[model samples]
Target chain A: PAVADKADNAFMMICTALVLFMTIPGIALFYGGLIRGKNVLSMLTQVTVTFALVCILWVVYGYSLAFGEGNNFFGNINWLMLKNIELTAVMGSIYQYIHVAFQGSFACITVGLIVGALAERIRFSAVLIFVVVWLTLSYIPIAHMVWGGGLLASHGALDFAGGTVVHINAAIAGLVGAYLPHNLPMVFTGTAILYIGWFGFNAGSAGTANEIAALAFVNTVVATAAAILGWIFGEWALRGKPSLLGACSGAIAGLVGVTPACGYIGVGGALIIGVVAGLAGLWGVTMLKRDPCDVFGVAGVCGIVGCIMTGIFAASSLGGVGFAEGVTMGHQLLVQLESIAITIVWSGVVAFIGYKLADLTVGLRVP
Target chain B: PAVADKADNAFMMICTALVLFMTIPGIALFYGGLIRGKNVLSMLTQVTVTFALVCILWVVYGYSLAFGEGNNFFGNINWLMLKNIELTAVMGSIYQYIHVAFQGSFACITVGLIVGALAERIRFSAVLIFVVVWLTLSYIPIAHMVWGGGLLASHGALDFAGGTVVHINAAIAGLVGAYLPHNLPMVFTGTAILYIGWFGFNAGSAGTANEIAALAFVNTVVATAAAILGWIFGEWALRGKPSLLGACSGAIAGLVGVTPACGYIGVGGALIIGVVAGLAGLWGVTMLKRDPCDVFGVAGVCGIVGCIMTGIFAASSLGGVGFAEGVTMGHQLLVQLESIAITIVWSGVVAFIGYKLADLTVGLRVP
Candidate 1:
């Protein structure tokens, strides 16, 4: 009989719920608050309906294509509708059901990151179409490559959580948002929810409740605090006032940067990643002429930097878990660059195709 | 050698984070939306600062007093500041640190429930003073009685979670608010967050990731959904229209009702409790003329019902794990009543005193 540890099952299930919470009201409120009040309800409707759509897609084929065995580019479809996987089947010390749900939650959040901001300006049906196209082509393949046994994994790339698969991938899609908080308090609330849910996103990536998970959990807290400080410090130094929105943004910046490194890096490493991520996110938002949200800026720059820093911080000397045997820092840096480049280009192109498809079919812009 | 299970540690730690999420923005937003707009900032501030205050007090002495080894009334002070505890010291199946945080979270939410509503009209210093006295006298002792081998536990009471320790206790204190959302969307957002975080609050009570926790997790989901449906249906039938606020309130009503029974009752029982709780809450707000929001009426009535019903649904024949080996259903129901009575009276006295202290010291009402 296949048996699973109850503890791992419990942790993973709760973690899955936490990650789902990230998208439902977490990103929804974050995005909702920043938009004009006249459009906030429409934005929320887009997020809600699209969120439901993503949930269905993930359950139907997204889980199978992202997680089932195949070549480097895509997973096999053997587990369609979760067939051939016994309810009690153990996967990584927990039940297969837990894995299915946890992995599906990532898909939800990744799409949420895009739809929350884009759907405000894009037609509702257009946004849904883009999600279907982008999720299948971009999210599934990147998830397969980084998390499942695919090209990046085969090349020994380290994305402890979802730096490449989620943050960067979604951020790039956001850039294609052809895109765009009126209420600062609402923004603050959403920021707090996202930070809370992120503990699950980062730590649950360890796939087991062990020392690595614990370390990741602690790192999330430390890095978030550091990022908040880092962001406000930058704002205070650069802008005349350290705004509440800036503080919230800094927390997110730190969180994004540390996503790839939290599980692999030490506390000290997490601190450094947080500060730099916060600073970089500040620049990313201020310097970019993209949408006012700068979701892409914060997400893209932080994810890229965090993933790249994983190359340096994962070294045993610098207090990361440890580099693979015979893998030099220089070699690791190149691999990091290659992996990041792959993510950006793949997501950028796929996102363009997705938006274009929506444009052709459903009339993309809301107005 | 006492070896703390890492999986349990991870599960409980994440659970701690989930429960904490319920407070920072979850309940905070819920209460913020129901109050006057001018008081919304003050409500958020009170919730945030009081949450912080509770976190500190729990670590410093609250945990020691509530959970340390001692007589029925309270535990000893040997573990003050956790001096005698090791960082890795096992408590139940997890680490003492995780246990400390999880228990502290319950305290935070309980206070958040009250301060979020009442503190708007009350002075900030008054609320702080009230928290110090009420938490120390009321929350600490009740937690001890119900969970820490205190008076209630010694008598074979069944509170799988905090129906009594948290909901009823806090609800009664609210009644003594002897007191009092601006935005319905904000309320809805907060309701969603609280519901999400509640899985941790319910399942984590098991102190281990076992069958009990899984059952609790599923029960929470079922009851919450049913309650939403039930509440909306009630609103439509009674008021001729269903409001967003009604749906949100229904979610919380079901959550409160299932608090004690989620771990003990079957999914069938969860569904029933959810419907009843929803209807009861609708009546609570409209019929009783309590507060418009019915924080007390919904929470108090639902909590009482759930606790009493735990006696019935816990029978082995009802798909529960079964009642205590020799305990009778009638006997169990009486015990549940006894426990409820104890909580209501205990919390009521403490709340009145706490209010008096705040009133005398800083003057209770805001100018």
Candidate 2:
């Protein structure tokens, strides 16, 4: 019989805290610094309140609906309030309690990422209403499909962490609500926190401290560093001098780009993906004429690129861990595209419904 | 046969990164925010350069002298540049490389803490020279004595995570050099990072992801939160309003107070220590007429108190893990006092020598 490994349990618990850290002061300060001075308090309030809301909601029903076996789109409620799960139940090598916390942290940060859209504009109650609707209808199902052995996973889509479930899902919601950055230094500080916490995000997804986790950890470091280099050099050439904002943006670009590919790709593959993502992200906000907050430009664009690149890079010949048996790169690429297409449509439609519900309940804009 | 445990390996690696995160932008931003705005850049530069210096030296010879084992004062230089250590060498349950990096981060932050004393007044060259001298003579030997089977450990002194080696040692050095925070928000931000990173600082000291590490992790959270409540209430009663600065100070007070006892005490013991340390720290800064910076007030006073409390709290009757067999609270208290007395005298004398050496070479204060 499998028992909990104390070492893995400790690793997962710390990783859970690291992810939550990325939300509170990490995303809070990042989003807070980018808004009008008067709205900074409001921005923080929204993030904190919604964060608390999501955490409570996760234990009540969110975990069961996303994790318990049921259908392609959703799971059963057998584990509601985490019922029926013994304290000693093992999830992989760690205790199920550790898994619940680690997975719950992902949910918290996903909702936290979306607050960027409502920053400086939305009513507080409306933000709460929107999160409840969007998380229940949009985020949970996508997480199930991608990670809970449902639609995307069944179709062999390769999202090692949460490119489609988290980044793209939240990115679309943020793109819908759309609202930078007033303070470059705050953005830089937030960027540093995100970079530091990301090691746990990417590596902890492995579910145990194995070779894959080690590879993911190294890839995250390499890719993010490379992305910063890529974005800054491009910015230096085009803008006449590199700005702190550009460097920060580049760091995020690399982080998002590496999210899906971190566990599967080798360091060489990570370096290439990071550079391409950085340059593409630069082109995204500027040439593409995108959101004011840069969330869609960096997280969205790099997320899409990272998903596509995972298919190409996960080949043993290219220094990756190799694709699943009998799965070819050509077929994997198609699956990747399908996953992205479905996520964009699913999240976009659900976000529209969520916003309309919020507006019906309490109105959307502050004024 | 000792072999690396992958789970422990993962835990320690992430813990090392978390500890390093505390220094670069953590302590750097914390100190930078409190100084004169004009010298902010210089403060950041001094921290960054000294941080790098300590890191390089740690690998070159610091690790050997501190951890390689020779006598009560110092160890032999057998592991210089990590030589003679196999890649598969195990330290506790994790790889030796992981241990080296983890220990090196502690050394870096200890050096970074001293910079707060030199914050607004010192010359850059002098900062570098002081770090080289102080780290070699003061930091390394203290770490060796308390942690590396030297004087303190040989005498049954308990320092689970460096109250004497880190908090008290660095605080005295900073007091001797004496430097708020110009920006309250920056201080708040740095405080949050330090609090987050301290989980690793305390829990990782357990060396493996076992029950002791879990206990440490919970104690860190409980103690810090308790300390905040104690300090803010004191401030609320003493002053008209509770300020953010007070909250941040309370946090450090709890962190430093819990440093030595985190792995040895229960939540009840931690709560008690936190409240006492928070109020003591309030008295320290307000009534003691201490240095302008609050390091001495919070870190120093709380550190000494925590060390002494560890003696009492580690008794099984107090809901603690209990002292070693045949070790009573009376004997432990005496040992604890002896350890603190030795540390204060040793660090003070060595720091004075380091400062004078720097003065001889490049002069101390900036002209």
Candidate 3:
């Protein structure tokens, strides 16, 4: 059993590394494939530098503001730069500070989603300024609200993984930042990396390798497969043929949808949710073609669907944890809607400020 | 303590996923960068198809043949497609079937290396036939002989990770498949992926989130950095400047050389190995320039160095698991040598047969 514990540590650390890979090569390739060949190097450079910046910022102040103990509004800055935390300090079971690093990586990738796209059109100085502002104002507060025992936890919302915090949160910012660009084959490669890394994103959310993690792991696979099938079928229906791009995108949609539900749903729930998510994602992307850059259409709409589904599927009566005392599906739905509204408004406002400030300092559009 | 067990599983699974990513995008990209734009699609298709084929085959029969019950040769086919294996079946505390899948992914990527490069020259039908032949004849047997209860394991050789089974075995097959066309950017992409995925390949060998895994993780980072520095330094010295290609190749060399010794050595040991491997890799590539596609020069030579280092570092006095009773470093070295020799002879002969058969079937060289 002691050795078993050691194995757990090994697993988490490895998972952390995999999560890191998602940002570096996973997102990088996905974007790389979409952009014109001439702009590829610029995109890569922006992603790499922003990635490094996120890492440094997270270690310096991001973790403390997001996770440090404080009131429901936000966390304190007691552990700035992880100063006060000792190496041996335990949070749950693993070292408390290590979890911060792991969690911080998720934040970095979310930022990557925005920075990667904005790199081409947006000024570099503006993008950095936007990242800092949005990270501080939008990301940190939302993280505290959901994960760090703030508003969402107080409201008893069930996000086993990060349907809202990552997908919806990033989608909103990406929409605000700029329009973006994938080669179908290249996109497929990125999708594969996302799929593989997702095991960590989903299962690792259990925070311990137990039945919950196992269930989440299996559900991730099922939902992803189902979503892929669903998207392919939908594409065939609409376009008379399915594409590799559609299949890959559908898989991601299902993945995003299931993030909040992976820990709560059974195989049957996962399957149904995946199909719905896949179809919705196809619709979302179709709508986006009319609008060019449509982060809001795909990530935002799919994220909302995923978030709402969590309310329905997580009912104890349906084999999930169920609603809180005196609370029904209607109440939970209302709560979920309110959360989404708040997230959208908060992120939009902060992103606007971030971008404008950056623009003022340098310029918004690339020369 | 209870929590640590969960951490270990988390680490292993995450690590396994990371390793899988390396094959999908890492090696794929590396080869993609190296090859010309014309061959990019062809190489990508080859890598993707072979990767999928390997996964399916491993699940269907490869796992049973390599890791199931057997004598000092190959395992039996008793556990085909994981038949009769329960989800909860424990192999060293983690689920046995999970371990099978995790290890199977490694085998999949190793085969990916050969497929990615040979896609250009070898006919599609011929390549498929070659993969089947090599996987069964060369890959499965060597895996059995080293990691399994085969000759190497029986003789107490310390391969800790898979320097011989993965790096050396695949390198030889790649060389045999070499008379193929080259691609540049594809190679760069592949190198990036390989470097990222290698963290899992090295650290996940510990199978737990303990001191050993941490040590391995850090060593992997250090070795990679040292290799980059070493290769760049040498490139600057020899070629008058370091090219992107040289940087990537050096990184791969360091990663390959450290594979077997990653979990067995100190950071200091890793740095030393990295530098040596980087320089050697550069030298190997130089020789290959005269004879295009010398996969063996870099991977084969670096793999040998790593295997030998394992023998030295695994000494109890050297901060690793000591040699078994009545076995000294010298004895272990001999065992390592024998394992390497067997791998070289077996892989070479099988590779030759595989290539010849393919040539006979549909011809080998590209038109």
Candidate 4:
């Protein structure tokens, strides 16, 4: 059916814009302000240029390989350059052109997240090379498995809005790349932008403005608020006062934690996940070898936790929307873990290859 | 008929979020970064506190008086606190709740614009007093006239969004309160957020995600891009170098210029308006006695220009969607000017009273 729903198309278009917003000034400023001033302009330039690169590639091949019907791991390229997808072709409830753009925006932000790991260390040319290789091998395939009804999705994986595809996937790739707060205010502003934009990221995943989307929207609000309070309490207990950076980190932790579970779970479930993720993110950042932007602590750890808990919270008895036919809690939990594991390994291997290829091509380090 | 539409509901909710976003972090940071560092925190607090005030008031009586059926200048209070509105009550194509929230957000941002004029000049208590008075009298009545099927709209005034209600209205209130780049990067970041969020402002005004919304969305993009280039060239010719602030101001100019005409006119019209507004905005800033921000220049001047031009471009012969039956372009132009005049007088008179009241009670100036 080539029917286009006005409401869904409008919702999707705005959502796509919000996601793109997260990259341009969002991640750019988020990462840019955390590094030395000397490298600030360089970070902005890299994010912008690579953003354009990923956008071009997504239209050319990424969307087709990730979304087109094919094997479990990858899709066919029938939609290369959107060749075969008609303007009126409906994807879910909206037009396919809107779908391409929505999907492409996800690809863009995933790449944006990775740049946080390479800030101030990698050469610009090296980042471009890395994005090309990583986006194809890692992002595209994983997007297929989680969202394109490939491996994980067929197995009833409940990664609602890209826990595996965006947060964990990008975090691992970021880790393999191997990567500070110079301007706290800039960081705060960026965090606020991301928080506002995430409504689209989470709710828009519902693909419609239905009760599910409303649920997701409310959950995002509750989870993020709870996370902020939870982190502030923890920081206040540990130190005399809570720092703005801690609050911002808590917001991110809650957001990442709620992403996978938002659409399917209840508000209470979101609150719980948010509180736990805030504390866990605090611990992760404190204990682990930190990256420049702390993507692993808030995104990777909270992403995995959210994915696993989605299996539990999604149970009807636990106030979630419930699982698919004949799918029990235990079985769904295993599926969640399987999806997470697949993403970790897939992204890790591909990111390693991406870094190596970049090293060979442009020398990863700045001279 | 009380019916819910998923697609429209989804779009409206996000649009509300986007509009609310422009006030809290968007306008807060935009105005905050332009003041002295000492008063930055104060600016944030004022915008935030007033945002809450307006939100509470909108729910209490603002929506009722502005939207409920009654006289041309205002509506009745039968729906006060949303008392008589059903949970599933539909307004336009979406739920009334969604409309309430979406419309409330516009009120929040309009109050936000006035804060820039009072930045570092007025007392926090006084700002609150002024916001209360101005929002009730000035914003509500004008919103009724243009959007709530009242005087101006009845006259077939074509304010697709809020050219008169928001931009010019806020600018005049700001002028009555009458008041910098301390952080140019922060200014640029805020500008980017505003531009991204304005999509919801313009397209969302279509009340659904249909061809009109898509057209508005495209027009917003084109006009903003053209305005940016237009202002940059003007700045370069004048100053020999294009500053980031200039580019940002140009963005605001373009955004303001396209607000009213986005849905009515064609892309070519949008481009022309953007270029003119950009150059006019530059002249307003450089030539006029500038406010703390140039809201008067970009918003007021460009806003007036956009509103009047809407009449000309909205003719089908000029590549527009066409004017209403029996409404000539010449006639529409008069209607547009009448609306603008009505807004200026109404806002100017109310703003004066509001400022005087603030001064009488708490004193307008900070001690």
Query: Model 2 over residues B1-367: C-alpha lDDT tens digits?
Result: 8988887888788789889989978888777667788988878888888899999999999999999989998998999899999999998899999999999999999988888547678888888888988899989999999988999999999989999999899988887776215776677677768878887899889887766776677567557756775776698789954556777778789889999999898666887888898888988888756334667657889999999999999998886888999999999999999999998898888888888888899998787
Superposed model 2: Cα runs more than 4 Å off: A10-14, A38-92, A95-181, A184-367, B79-88, B288-292, B317-319, B360-362
Q: Which pairs of residues collide in model 1?
A: A33-A181, A33-A182, A34-A181, B33-B181, B33-B182, B34-B181, B35-B181
Model 1 superposed RMSD (Cα): 7.5
Highest DockQ against the true fold, candidate: 3
Tens digits of lDDT, candidate 1, B98-199: 677689889989999988878667877788899999999999999999999999988888888899999999989988875523688878878987998898
lDDT for each residue of candidate 1 in A132-230, tens digit (9 for 90 to 100) = 999999999999999888999889899999999999999899987744247767776877778888978988888877667766775675566567667
User: Could you give me the TM-score of model 4 versus the true structure?
Assistant: 0.65
Worst ten in a row by lDDT for model 3 chain B: B1-10
Assess candidate 2 and give its lDDT: 0.84
lDDT of predicted model 3: 0.76
TM-score of 1: 0.65
Candidate 3 residues B154-253, lDDT tens each?
8887776788899889888887667433656556766776777787788778876667778888888888888889889999999899988788778888
RMSD per candidate (Å) reads 7.5, 7.6, 7.5, 7.7
Residues B1-367 of candidate 4 have per-residue lDDT tens digits of: 6566787788778788878878878888787768888988888888888889999999999999999987899988887899999988899889999999999999998988888557678888988898999999989988988898899999999998899999999988887667316876677677777877888899889888776776677567657756776786798799975566777788789899999999998666877888888888898888766246566767999999899989998988876889999999989999999999999999999999998998999988898
lDDT of 4 by residue, A116-221 (tens): 5575798767887888999999899999999988999999999878999999999888877763178888888788878877887998899887899899999999
